Amino acid sequence: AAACERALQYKLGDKIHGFTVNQVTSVPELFLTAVKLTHDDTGARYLHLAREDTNNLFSVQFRTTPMDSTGVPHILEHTVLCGSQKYPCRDPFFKMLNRSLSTFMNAFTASDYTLYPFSTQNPKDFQNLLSVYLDATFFPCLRELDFWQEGWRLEHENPSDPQTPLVFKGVVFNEMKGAFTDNERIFSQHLQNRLLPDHTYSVVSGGDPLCIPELTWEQLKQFHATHYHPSNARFFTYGNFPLEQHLKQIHEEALSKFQKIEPSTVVPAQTPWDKPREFQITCGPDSFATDPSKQTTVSVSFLLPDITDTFEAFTLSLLSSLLTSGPNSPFYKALIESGLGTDFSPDVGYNGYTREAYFSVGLQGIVEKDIETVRSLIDRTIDEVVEKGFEDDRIEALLHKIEIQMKHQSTSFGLMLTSYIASCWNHDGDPVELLKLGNQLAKFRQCLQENPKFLQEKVKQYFKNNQHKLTLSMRPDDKYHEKQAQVEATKLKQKVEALSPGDRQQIYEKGLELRSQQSKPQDASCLPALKVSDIEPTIPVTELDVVLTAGDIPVQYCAQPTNGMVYFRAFSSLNTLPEELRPYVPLFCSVLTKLGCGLLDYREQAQQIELKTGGMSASPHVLPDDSHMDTYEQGVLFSSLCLDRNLPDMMQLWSEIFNNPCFEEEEHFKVLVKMTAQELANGIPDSGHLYASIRAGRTLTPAGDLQETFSGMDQVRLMKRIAEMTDIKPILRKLPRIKKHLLNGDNMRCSVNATPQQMPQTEKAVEDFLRSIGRTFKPWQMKTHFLMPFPVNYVGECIRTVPYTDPDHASLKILARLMTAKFLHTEIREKGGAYGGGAKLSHNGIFTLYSYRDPNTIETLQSFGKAVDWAKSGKFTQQDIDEAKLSVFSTVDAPVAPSDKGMDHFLYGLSDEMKQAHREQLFAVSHDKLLAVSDRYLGTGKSTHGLAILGPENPKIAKDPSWIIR
């Protein structure tokens, strides 16, 4: 009845559709049985992980070893998703994204391999996506004009005017422009290139913008014919679906059409250096920093063995975690608390993506005069670790942390396994040996108990006696990007001058045909698709029981197969808090569990947290009510995790944090605030559309204003202001004031997710913890421009609509997904040139339009206006509504892990009755209701708009009196 029981029936030497069973291993700590097959005729390798998890995942892996910095596997990865032989239609990937019930569908290109994974829960959907993926990777139409669109091409500044000069355009070209505006990517790339300068790791695999136009269409076709051959492929599947169906599809669709080749693609070993080296590089000065003399980053890197010998890599990874993770690590005490820098260097710790892994440590944010100081600190610190070793409590904490990651149940487990074995498997390693974590832990414990200086000899061998050291420093130059502009313009002129007028007319005519390709709406009916009849009408009910305890705290217990894990959550309201202290509540949540409690200093507190729990965190949440736009819930979520046996210790930790938090530890507090502020400044681009949509919605609902206070740009500006204060004491006095309003049991509710066998002891520990603790808005329009020194823009427009329980809400959600799939995607992405762009509908009722990395600004809002006119126009078919329903049900029915089932009832108070009502409204939504809601809410002048833009200077915006610039 189970998956691993039938999977254990595969005997060695069995022939199944051209494959041969080579190895079957039971992995009891992961509740799975691994099966390794190879195709006899082609030599393709297959690893199947059978586990009773309904979220089945497929992935295929190709070894791509580039020998130049042209970016050929990255552009080829983009090009294979544009069309294949059996499905000649345009863009099969994104079209199947709206014709499937997938939960994830993407592709990855690492430094030396490319990986194409997908996951879904429906077996027919699995067969459909498997056919589209096999066909996309192995038989693409590799049309040259698609290569001109996705890769690089010459194009006029106005594509219709052949007398303006030609400039470079391309998707990957601007991807690499954005790769080398990032200082961290320059540092990481140059570090990897300098440490392994012999072979494929010495080049920029993503593409050097000055070396990208050397790639021709014929070179791309040869690269595809050489590397995307099934003899150079690794196939991987995970889940409970029958293996035989997969093998029948793989054989009958792809592998039968090829014959055996011998890939000459093995990456040779790096020859060890005789002497350490130093290199100096330069980057672009960051504008978020305020001091220019404190912008130097320095690192020291060590070469470690190969990933093939699994054991030694596991050992050195544990050693690297012991050396750099947490305030009890030697390097934290030596570097962070020295006050020389601001944070660790990039790629800090163990980096096992290359063939030979490497260790890195260093600082960023130092003054250039302190480079030799840092190098001496690292040398002296290594000497102290050699002489003193590690204490046993930290080793136990590390082994307990790895045990927790082994037992924890995620929703994307198969994705974690394929990413965790891809690197070892890529270099002819045994992927099954990485799965047996219990065996390696046992051997590690034995190796420590037999030799007390085991870790001391390992740090000695790989740090004190390893001559393969790389010291690399990076300091910015104020004129770097003008040099960059000069060299790209020089290659531009060098390539444009050699073109004849007939060549230029060929470029112009291809440009007009390309623009038509980007404009003409095409048919995608040759792709397979699911119907609404395959969507389940009702969901299985989730069982809860609320027990009032001690003497009025509601506690929600949900029996779940969590595999010996207990997840405890508590949510405390903020309704009694004075309004002056609201903006410092994220800071309060971010430092509360890191400063010490009772008789424990911050080092001992961090040791206890890492030794007993899986992590304890606090974060502010604003939970809107579902039936009133002007009603909301504000609060703080305390969340923790522990193994079954360490539960009373965890609740004792929570009691000590609730009754005696250490608000007097000032030195470590200054470190934490400067680190949090630096992290917030580094994360602006990846969440730029999030910050823009949150700013645009501040003036529409009270909940929006509070969400801007807790997590908007206000929080970043506040964190920077606090991080620039020289005297931190007036900020530190605010923390007891918040503590006396939050850490009590007056307005509290709790949740527990655990196995039913553990439940009475858990009920006792929580009931023991609860006894141990103390006892009309009118929206108005606003336009905001953050003048940011960015090369791309982030635009957000918010529209006020109905809440969740309103019958029009489900129709609005369908309309939002419809507009995203059939208008905004083509216009903003293909035509506009943005990396991401669409429309979303939130639970509170804010209809948000967003753009991500958009080179335009005014045209984006104008395309939003043309999009709402399109939605009112009704120019969409019934099949488009079917695709929108499919995508929405692909989103709302995404799998939930045992640790958050059910979280919606605990946080937002939506019952199963409410979810079923909204599900039947999503079923009953029709074309006329979509027209009705489009003319009632999204139309111009019917509701209040809000706009916000993060991006570079726009002179026309500066002359607009209706805009406020911040």
Numbering used by the authors: 31 to 805, 847 to 1037
What is written in the article reporting this PDB entry?
Presequence protease (PreP), a 117 kDa mitochondrial M16C metalloprotease vital for mitochondrial proteostasis, degrades presequence peptides cleaved off from nuclear-encoded proteins and other aggregation-prone peptides, such as amyloid β (Aβ). PreP-N and PreP-C, in the closed state of PreP, form an enclosed catalytic chamber to entrap and degrade monomeric amyloidogenic peptides, thereby preventing the formation of toxic aggregates.
They were refined to an open state (O) and two partially open states (pO1 and pO2) with resolutions of 4, 3.7, 3.9, respectively. Apo-PreP has three states, O, pO1, and pO2 that are distinct from each other with the two pO states being slightly more open than the pC or C states. 3D classification revealed that most PreP particles (~74%) were in the partially open (pO) states, indicating that PreP in the absence of substrate prefers to be in a state inaccessible to substrate binding. Consistent with the cryoEM data, the SEC-SAXS data confirms that apo-PreP in solution also prefers to adopt the pO state (72% based on OLIGOMER and 90% based on ensemble optimization modeling (EOM)). The fact that PreP in solution prefers the pO state rather than the open state is logical because the transition from the pO states to O state loses substantial buried surface (650–940 Å2) and a network of hydrogen bonds and salt bridges, and thus is energetically unfavorable. The switch A and C regions in the pO states have lower resolution and higher thermal B factors than the rest of PreP structures. As switch A contains residues involved in substrate peptide binding and catalytic zinc ion coordination, such high dynamics would render the pO state catalytically incompetent.
